[PDB]
Amino acid sequence: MIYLRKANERGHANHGWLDSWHTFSFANYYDPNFMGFSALRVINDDVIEAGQGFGTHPHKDMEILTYVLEGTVEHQDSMGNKEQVPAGEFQIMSAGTGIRHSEYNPSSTERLHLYQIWIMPEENGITPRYEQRRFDAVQGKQLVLSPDARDGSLKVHQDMELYRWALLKDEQSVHQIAAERRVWIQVVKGNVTINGVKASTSDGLAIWDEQAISIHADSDSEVLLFDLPPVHHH
């Protein structure tokens, strides 16, 4: 089973200050097939105007991950947590029992482009936490999130692993995967072929009932590989 979630068929809302593409049903947007893939519930491709952002709002039981692609984002939460995340970096927050936060573009002249990812925690009512990490760039398979925070990855309260995979043109690799585990691949940029399916910038791929993920880069690319726990008519 392999399904392509085309970039142009994503939900879309443009409020001027924010332009967002939704991979899965979000708020008032509903997609009968893409309701949420395993523990992966939200993937919003957001572009925010200089000086704008999301005012303070509450969250409960949910792991919120942010990946900045361009510009800078300023985080503030119902705590003392203040932080600026530049392009290329990640940040993660566990809403746990409850929490409020805001995110805005501190630049007074440059836009902000980021991915807002929501992961359902396998454990509910945990304690609120905020972490940020600066990984050292390097063309390879880098671990970003892990249940145990192994190999320099950030901890995530869910039986899932997230990799940032940078591939040069004509490069190729493989990722095992056992049991009834599922995989979501989001192409941040570039053109790749995965298990016989071509995908380009902003495309997503749902895969399951497979034991190996074969990836070939048709051009320099970068993908996020979500290795999700076992569990729509694609």
Swiss-Prot record:
Miscellaneous section: Quercetin is a flavonoid compound synthesized by a variety of plants, including foods for human consumption.
GO molecular function, one term: quercetin 2,3-dioxygenase activity
Regulation: Inhibited by kojic acid, sodium diethyldithiocarbamate and 1,10-phenanthroline monohydrochloride.
Description of its domains: Is composed of two structurally similar domains arranged face to face.
Binding-site positions, a divalent metal cation: 57, 59, 101, 103
Function: Has quercetin 2,3-dioxygenase activity in vitro. Its physiological role is unknown; however, may provide a mechanism that would avoid inhibition of key cellular proteins, such as DNA gyrase, by quercetin.
Record field: catalytic activity: quercetin + O2 = 2-(3,4-dihydroxybenzoyloxy)-4,6-dihydroxybenzoate + CO
SUPFAM superfamilies noted in UniProt: RmlC-like cupins (SSF51182)
Domain of life: Bacteria
InterPro entries in UniProt: Pirin, Pirin_N_dom, Quercetinase_C, RmlC-like_jellyroll, RmlC_Cupin_sf
UniProtKB keywords: Copper, Dioxygenase, Iron, Metal-binding, Oxidoreductase, Zinc
Note on how the cofactor is bound: Binds 1 divalent metal cation, Zn(2+), Co(2+) or Fe(2+).
Pathway named in the protein's UniProt entry: Flavonoid metabolism; quercetin degradation
Cofactor entry: Zn(2+); Co(2+); Fe(2+)
Enzyme Commission identifier(s): 1.13.11.24
PANTHER family xrefs: QUERCETIN 2,3-DIOXYGENASE (PTHR43212:SF3)
Organism of provenance: Escherichia coli (strain K12)
UniProt record similarity statement: Belongs to the pirin family.
Record-given protein name: Quercetin 2,3-dioxygenase
